[PDB]
Write a protein that binds this DNA or RNA. Structure first.
Ligand SMILES: [Mg+2]
Ligand SMILES: [Mg+2]
Ligand SMILES: [Zn+2]
Length: 155
DNA sequence: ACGTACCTGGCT
DNA sequence: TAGGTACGT
């Protein structure tokens, strides 16, 4: 049951950007503070990486917990048009996996930064984020993800 | 003003 | 591909 009326829910949905979202803005700011001259929204790479760091041959995705189905407190299965959302979100999850595989096949190290780690009552501190980012980017560690519990290598 | 909880279409 | 709105602070 939606907390908005049709018109309002439509307005809310129309306001959602496809780049330069809240989580992308905070990550950009963190990377800029670190002195990294990164690129963004690379339509030439699989999944159009949110961020690209050529200098360390790595890319970074900022995942919205709803859109990418993170199994965290931010995600709830829609109670309206459930079938539609389950298929759409399910397809997003499958595409996310494929994108990561392709990038790796191209020689790119991938880092996933979940939204809950960037905003919300469980978000990591600026210091904690900056440290984990700098260590992962500048290091040679394989693909990983950052959630509220810190950083972890991808399966 | 601001942080969080509650919710789940639009635009290329 | 979050972010509008209601609420408590
Ligand atoms: Mg993107
Ligand atoms: Mg993203
Ligand atoms: Zn999450």
């Amino acid at each position: 049951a939606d907390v908005h009326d049709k018109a309002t829910r439509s307005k809310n949905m129309r306001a959602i950007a496809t780049r330069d979202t809240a989580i992308e803005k905070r990550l950009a700011s963190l990377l800029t503070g670190q002195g990294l001259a990164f690129r963004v929204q690379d339509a030439s790479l699989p999944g159009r990486p949110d961020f690209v760091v050529d200098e360390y041959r790595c890319v970074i995705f900022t995942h919205g917990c709803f859109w990418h189905h993170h199994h965290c407190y931010l995600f709830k299965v829609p109670a309206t048009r459930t079938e539609f959302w389950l298929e759409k979100i399910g397809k997003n999850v499958e595409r996310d996996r494929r994108d990561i595989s392709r990038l790796q096949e191209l020689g790119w190290r991938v880092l996933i930064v979940w939204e809950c780690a960037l905003r919300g009552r469980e978000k990591l501190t600026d210091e904690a984020l900056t440290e984990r980012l700098e260590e992962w980017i500048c290091g040679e560690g394989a693909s990983a993800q950052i959630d509220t519990q810190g950083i972890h290598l991808l399966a």
